[PDB]
Amino acid sequence: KETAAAKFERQHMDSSTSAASSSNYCNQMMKSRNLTKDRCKPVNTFVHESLADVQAVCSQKNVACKNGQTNCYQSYSTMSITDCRETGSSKYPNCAYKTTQANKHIIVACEGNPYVPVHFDASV
Template sequence: MVIPGGPQGIEATMALKTLVLFSLLVLGLLVIVGAQPPAFKRFQERHMDTGPGPFDPPYCNKTMYQRNLLKRNFNTFVHESLKDVHDVCWEENYIFKNRTCNNCHKSSNRMSITECSIIGRNPIRYRTKNSKKYIVIACDGIWPVHFDGSE
């Protein structure tokens, strides 16, 4: 029997509060994940690789094939944490290559990237070039959705 105000009642109340707080946290995370635009997932698939790098010459051939990006003549992979790339969306708007882009942002620091350039079509082969550059991305609100380039 639980006596209100007794030690068992206090433990039951604390357990209930903990359960409610945990449930709210899980619900909040689900809402955040569900609110991500589909373009953000495409951005991750096409441009994110949090591996440490630098990468050897076969990297682009292997990665472009694994991610089904073989129709692209050029692609860039960013080797930074998703948080660091996500933070670029908080930078001020940036005009890149004299284009009007209301939602472009340039990283405040150089980031580790790998550029993949097509060098052969039969079979498809890519050149792998590792470097550290500023990245320019377009954001949908707070979500990176398009890799616009690097400089």
């Protein structure tokens, strides 16, 4: 089984690009990160920052997770993000996504030793 930390990396980290360069970014990335394997993951955010910069959020602004738990942290600064969301028509196994690039704060749930991101809660 994948570790919670490795699963966060695979689903949320895109340190290789500064931003989504086309409308097809999400179709490509949802596929290459194995988020369309058995079903279409409806919503997924990729972060265009270093792994170190995203891990560092776990010692930034402590906030509530939307589930009401208290191991969530908001980034002090904005980050380059891409929101991926299934289109209204999308049907497995022809998953189709809308790509939205933005600069926003990220909120992540952190856990473990080392204390690292295990869930992407939201971007603000």
